[PDB]
Amino acid sequence: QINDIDVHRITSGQVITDLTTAVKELVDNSIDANANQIEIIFKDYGLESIECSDNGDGIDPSNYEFLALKHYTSKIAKFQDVAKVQTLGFRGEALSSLCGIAKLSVITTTSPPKADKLEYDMVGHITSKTTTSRNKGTTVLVSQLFHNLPVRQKEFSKTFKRQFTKCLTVIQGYAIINAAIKFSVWNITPKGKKNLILSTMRNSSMRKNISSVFGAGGMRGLEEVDLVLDLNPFKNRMLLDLDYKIRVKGYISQNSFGCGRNSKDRQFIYVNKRPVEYSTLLKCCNEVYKTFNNVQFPAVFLNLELPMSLIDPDKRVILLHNERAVIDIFKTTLSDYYNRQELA
Amino acid sequence: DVHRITSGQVITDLTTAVKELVDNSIDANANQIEIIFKDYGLESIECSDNGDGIDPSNYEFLALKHYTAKVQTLGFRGEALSSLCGIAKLSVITTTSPPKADKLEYDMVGHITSKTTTSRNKGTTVLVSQLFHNLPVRQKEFSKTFKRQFTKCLTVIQGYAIINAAIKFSVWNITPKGKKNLILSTMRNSSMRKNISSVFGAGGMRGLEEVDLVLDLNPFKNRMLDYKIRVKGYISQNSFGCGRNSKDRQFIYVNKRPVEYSTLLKCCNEVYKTFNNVQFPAVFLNLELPMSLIDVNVTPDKRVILLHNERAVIDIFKTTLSDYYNRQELALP
Ligand SMILES: Nc1ncnc2c1ncn2[C@@H]1O[C@H](COP(=O)(O)OP(=O)(O)NP(=O)(O)O)[C@@H](O)[C@H]1O
Numbered sequence: 163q164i165n166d167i168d169v170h171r172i173t174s175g176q177v178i179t180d181l182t183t184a185v186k187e188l189v190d191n192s193i194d195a196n197a198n199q200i201e202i203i204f205k206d207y208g209l210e211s212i213e214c215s216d217n218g219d220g221i222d223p224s225n226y227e228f229l230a231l232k233h234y235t236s237k238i239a240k241f242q243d244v245a246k247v248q249t250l251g252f253r254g255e256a257l258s259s260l261c262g263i264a265k266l267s268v269i270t271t272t273s274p275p276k277a278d279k280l281e282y283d284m285v286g287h288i289t290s291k292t293t294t295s296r297n298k299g300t301t302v303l304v305s306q307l308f309h310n311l312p313v314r315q316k317e318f319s320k321t322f323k324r325q326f327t328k329c330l331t332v333i334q335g336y337a338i339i340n341a342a343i344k345f346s347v348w349n350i351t352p353k354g355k356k357n358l359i360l361s362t363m364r365n366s367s368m369r370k371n372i373s374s375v376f377g378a379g380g381m382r383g384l385e386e387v388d389l390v391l392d393l394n395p396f397k398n399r400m401l402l403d404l405d406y407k408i409r410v411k412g413y414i415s416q417n418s419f420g421c422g423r424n425s426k427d428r429q430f431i432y433v434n435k436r437p438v439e440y441s442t443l444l445k446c447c448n449e450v451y452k453t454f455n456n457v458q459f460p461a462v463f464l465n466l467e468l469p470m471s472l473i474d475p476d477k478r479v480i481l482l483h484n485e486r487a488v489i490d491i492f493k494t495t496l497s498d499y500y501n502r503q504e505l506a
Numbered sequence: 507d508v509h510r511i512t513s514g515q516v517i518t519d520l521t522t523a524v525k526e527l528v529d530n531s532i533d534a535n536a537n538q539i540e541i542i543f544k545d546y547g548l549e550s551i552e553c554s555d556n557g558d559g560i561d562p563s564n565y566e567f568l569a570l571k572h573y574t575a576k577v578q579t580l581g582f583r584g585e586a587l588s589s590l591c592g593i594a595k596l597s598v599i600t601t602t603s604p605p606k607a608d609k610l611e612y613d614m615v616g617h618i619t620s621k622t623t624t625s626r627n628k629g630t631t632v633l634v635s636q637l638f639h640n641l642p643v644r645q646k647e648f649s650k651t652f653k654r655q656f657t658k659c660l661t662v663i664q665g666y667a668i669i670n671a672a673i674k675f676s677v678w679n680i681t682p683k684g685k686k687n688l689i690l691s692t693m694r695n696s697s698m699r700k701n702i703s704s705v706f707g708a709g710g711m712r713g714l715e716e717v718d719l720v721l722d723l724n725p726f727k728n729r730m731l732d733y734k735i736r737v738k739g740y741i742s743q744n745s746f747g748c749g750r751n752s753k754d755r756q757f758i759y760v761n762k763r764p765v766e767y768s769t770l771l772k773c774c775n776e777v778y779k780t781f782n783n784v785q786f787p788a789v790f791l792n793l794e795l796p797m798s799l800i801d802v803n804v805t806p807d808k809r810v811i812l813l814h815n816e817r818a819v820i821d822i823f824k825t826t827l828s829d830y831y832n833r834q835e836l837a838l839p
């Protein structure tokens with residue numbers, strides 16, 4: 163009843179839930195490519211297309227053919243050097259998925275200015291390779307998103323405005339923590355307007371970026387946070403030992419009356435410079451803050467820096483070593499940070 | 507803090523503030539725009555449209571800016587509005603779903619300060635008040651040059667009104683003492699010709715004749731595909747008395763969009779001087795041209811544009827214009 167292509171269509175649809183997820187996948191790939199410059203161009207807010215341009219390492223020409231194919235034991239076994247082909251691609255699920263539920267194009271180069279333009283069909287095969295030029299880096303273009311998921315596409319049209327803002331929030335997250343990276347975001351309107359949406363300067367402190375990304379009001383009520391949670395006496399599994407110290411740097415709203423937010427609409431948390439979904443740590447943030455200002459939620463921009471060695475259908479749901487202790491040492495450490503702020 | 511200085515550089519005067527509002531309404535697909543000044547804008551300026559409203563999702567960043575070839579216009583989302591929040595007090599009554607509406611209040615930084623409920627037809631009403639209040643120098647300048655400043659602003663609205671055949675424009679000024687005065691009014695779905703009469707009156711079409719010209723610039727492209735420019739509109743004839751005593755009615759548009767293109771008007775003016783040296787011509791010209799042939803982001807003025815290979819454009823436009831006038835006089839008798 164349901165043919166293989168459909169299965170591929172539906173599954174890839176489970177991978178790229180919406181425009182925002184697609185964007186996440188593209189930004190992540192660029193950062194992974196060691197880009198220091200990332201440009202994102204939306205056409206009609208995403209309805210038409212999204213383009214991600216970086217100056218990263220680019221894609222090795224040998225990977226072109228296997229970049230967006232889905233990995234199947236059955237098809238790999240059809241190669242003489244199985245070990246070899248499995249190092250030429252079949253990585254991840256993103257590009258492989260954007261192929262099934264969208265039109266994927268790539269322009270890349272590992273040797274500027276000689277470059278290639280690749281068109282991949284729904285199944286990962288290269289329908290056309292065109293000679294072109296471009297500086298070091300890669301450009302990924304996702305167009306006609308969900309063109310073969312009528313129901314989802316239709317929903318996208320009657321909710322594109324909210325979707326974009328959701329997608330913008332996520333772009334703001336990447337831009338605030340990635341100081342060594344310059345982000346630029348434009349939206350080209352059907353009426354021919356190139357509307358600048360967001361921009362940060364390369365080599366900008368988190369502060370300079372919050373101010374760019376949220377205007378002068380962005381810092382209003384904010385106070386620097388510089389904490390060190392010593393967790394060494396809390397590691398559980400016995401063996402130049404690991405220094406289990408967590409450095410928490412960033413900014414958070416001061417408990418001062420009013421200085422907070424009416425909504426928990428502006429909270430960002432990072433673990434080793436990467437947006438992470440720390441549900442637990444936010445709950446803690448919120449409660450500890452209530453005790454000082456009940457009628458408001460705190461704006462958050464905190465980076466948890468620590469060794470990944472002590473770090474373990476969605477994404478990067480991270481769990482730290484003995485998270486229960488962490489949560490407690492943080493709760494009191496922050497609380498006492500606010501108490502010290504009141505005395506100010 | 508140093509935010510308002512930046513705002514002041516963005517919204518230099520009343521006119522600029524109005525362009526910002528009018529463009530937003532037009533961008534919102536309104537076919538009805540009504541502008542109300544209270545004391546020529548010294549107290550406030552109200553722009554009401556029947557556009558598609560502001561989706562609730564955009565409220566938060568509505569007045570926030572997230573910063574610092576086949577394109578025709580350049581935009582800096584949030585810049586205009588956050589700048590109006592800076593040097594002034596901004597109010598908003600919008601809705602994408604009538605008959606229920608939201609009334610927003612922003613402070614100088616953009617933080618929403620009040621969101622109460624009301625009602626209105628589909629659309630948006632933007633209220634700008636106390637323009638430049640926190641900028642004394644200019645604030646006073648304004649109140650001391652409001653006449654030329656208002657005239658400069660009305661002329662810009664007159665520019666929009668005339669070319670936007672799909673929109674019904676209406677403009678009023680409420681005196682400090684109380685009653686409303688209709689200053690501008692156009693019926694919608696009207697030709698430039700009809701609008702010229704509505705905006706200026708019985709004598710608006712005086713001595714004006716049609717202009718339908720084509721400028722071929724194909725062989726004037728250096729540094730690099732059909733570079734032709736369809737120039738349509740009206741211009742005064744050169745016969746005695748058929749012109750204006752001054753350049754108070756010279757409008758140029760590029761792709762149905764208003765722009766300041768002095769060099770072209772300069773061309774029109776000097777070419778006209780060739781036949782008449784006591785008057786200037788009334789000009790209403792639209793220049794159709796492929797976007798790819800329009801260079802954007804040429805100066806801090808997000809609206810200022812530069813035509814592909816201007817140098818020649820003028821030259822061909824000047825001679826083409828001359829032939830126009832020569833051909834024109836032939837059928838005088
Ligand atoms: N912008 C880019 N620059 C260079 N290579 C890229 C870029 N985007 C994608 N690729 C290549 O495409 C392959 C995978 O894309 P993707 O489908 O996101 O999987 P992944 O990055 O390997 N895994 P994941 O981290 O889970 O997304 C990568 O392993 C790269 O080799």
Ligand SMILES: Nc1ncnc2c1ncn2[C@@H]1O[C@H](COP(=O)(O)OP(=O)(O)NP(=O)(O)O)[C@@H](O)[C@H]1O
Pocket residue numbers: 357526529530531533534555557558559560564568580581582583584585586587588629630631632808
């Ligand atoms: N009258 C209106 N109706 C609907 N939406 C509006 C209106 N005025 C403003 N907006 C919204 O507010 C946002 C921007 O205001 P503005 O600050 O002028 O930037 P912009 O229009 O995006 N760019 P620019 O053309 O460079 O000014 C728009 O992008 C709309 O989403």
Ligand SMILES: [Mg+2]
Pocket residue numbers: 187190191254256
């Ligand atoms: Mg990836």
Ligand SMILES: [Mg+2]
Pocket residue numbers: 526529530586
């Ligand atoms: Mg605008």
